[PDB]
Symmetry: D5
Subunit: 83 residues, 10 copies
């Protein structure tokens, strides 16, 4: 019940939406290499790229809330930081 | 890892229509479960784009081995049901 | 009128399509004729069901304006 | 397989799927108050019932024996 | 009267059929005859159980008028 | 040489399925007020119990060693 | 219900859970040839088996009857 | 594979798993009044967030297109 | 066939032990019987012993126990 | 409960989930041969192991008895 309506409910829900978008992109990535039709493959790459933009959009929202966005700012330094 | 023109192509696209609509229902539930405006905006945006994804997969099954002859008497047989 | 009605009809579309896929998997799992033929009949009827639920959800509140530009988005790729 | 461990078990599962679909449509008749939705739910449920009965006719004269469904209406009779 | 009793009995039919499917899958994975015999016995009893549930759900609520015209729709494809 | 994870484990699964069926039907006796449903539920549930007992007696002789279910009556009695 | 579907359902679930754990440890015994794993997995399997037998005696003193689980040793030989 | 099938899809799945862990730990933050547990939970949740950020930058620095990380900040402001 | 065939399996066995303890505890806290409570708490104690045993097994195996030497200090290192 | 099932069982679940994360990354080490992936996966797996150790002492440095985890090194040695 103690939920500021906006500061803690939709955050778990939008992380869920990120997960769902990512799984959908995974399925379309599995399906690009599963036929030799060219138009179907093309429309699948289009929908896959659009879902990819969805994932980026939900990610950029999920960063700018009460969770810590400095972790997704210290990521470019921590990537190369492994030797 | 597998290639077939009939089921390995059609069954998967029928599944994809289900997946698009699952996303649509989930998004519609997320529109009606908060009062955020940024979240509402990005959710209705993503929801409308999946609505295009679902319509496109519906044309894929139409322009596939399945028959778009079901979608020619459907507007009348809905009306043929009262 | 909403999830009470719309989410349930989306779900019924999933169920119809799942029945078509399952019966198609059972048709491509034999080379008989009795099961194949009557399963083709049940498959055809399931497909009609899915089309019917699709026209209903179009003729309800939601925006089927994607199913008006779907014929143009199919044609637009060659 | 294809008749022993496959087809009949798979067709039993097909009957199972028809029963589940009808269960969903019957729950959906009384979970809204629309008339168009009510009409098409009853219509699709009727056709599903046709599907389930016909799959039952297949399983009767398929590998399983249609002698069990016939010596059961009297075992029901055991309720008064 | 609805999904709590009748649909639940349809669920019971589902459970009977799945139990028969599992026991039949277990009969076709060995040639030990003692297990095969008791498994086939239990399966025959499950089969009568499932038939019993089917005739009850015919009487409880939904219409078995398809289950009177089912041999009639079976015959139409030969 | 599989009578272990091809014969015995399968019977553990069969006991699991029987017990789950008994639990499901017992939930179905406690979810309505009908007599006919009561009659068929009590009949089929008792027969399922018989099935579970049959599978248990099968698993006793198949593989595992029943040194516990002969020494078990003392561990219940060990208090109260 | 409580004693019928809170007491009995819970202990049948306990038997099922014991069976699931035993099946998992048995699958892991035949999925390696290590000696530490074999020894400790067989030990844990022995203790789970003890747990399962004890849960079975618990359900004996509940809603199921040994009127079938005492006629199971007599009914096994008469089935082939 | 090790570039497309098993590499890009797998890293997206790992991102999903880390996000599920973050959501779970946030649920455990809102279900207690312990402060040592709260502290370790916000620390581990932050570390999972660090994992999610790292996996996101890798999947960007992989085959997939990081052009969304140039477009999304403009397409979000465009939403009212 | 030495790491992910066995180590994931031993972690899974630990998972089963943990779920068994949680389920047993939920069934101990669902009645006011003492025979069932006592023997179920006993079985839970053996489940705890099992989880402990598998944990010591995984320590002398492929994963790194370098966390279990400074973990008592990083636990306290939070105030 | 705030201490029994709302706190303790949740921590049992959290340890289970951390083991799941390490297991998934261990499955992913056996599904590719890239070096960027190996580096970041080893980092996140090492951090997950740290998480699991932290939750293990939290459940240990609680009211339940870490006395099984004080005589474990002796009872395994009792296994051959
Ligand atoms: Fe999307
Ligand atoms: Fe989608
Ligand atoms: Fe249908
Ligand atoms: Fe049965
Ligand atoms: Fe049964
Ligand atoms: Fe155990
Ligand atoms: Fe146990």
């Amino acid at each position: 019940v103690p939920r500021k309506m906006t500061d803690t409910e939709l955050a778990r829900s939008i992380r869920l939406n990120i997960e769902a978008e990512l799984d959908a992109i995974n399925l379309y990535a599995a399906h690009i290499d599963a036929t030799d039709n060219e138009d179907a493959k093309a429309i699948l790459q289009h929908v896959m790229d659009e879902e990819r933009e969805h994932a980026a959009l939900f990610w950029e929202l999920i960063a700018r809330l009460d969770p810590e966005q400095a972790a997704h700012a210290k990521e470019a330094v921590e990537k190369y930081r492994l030797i």
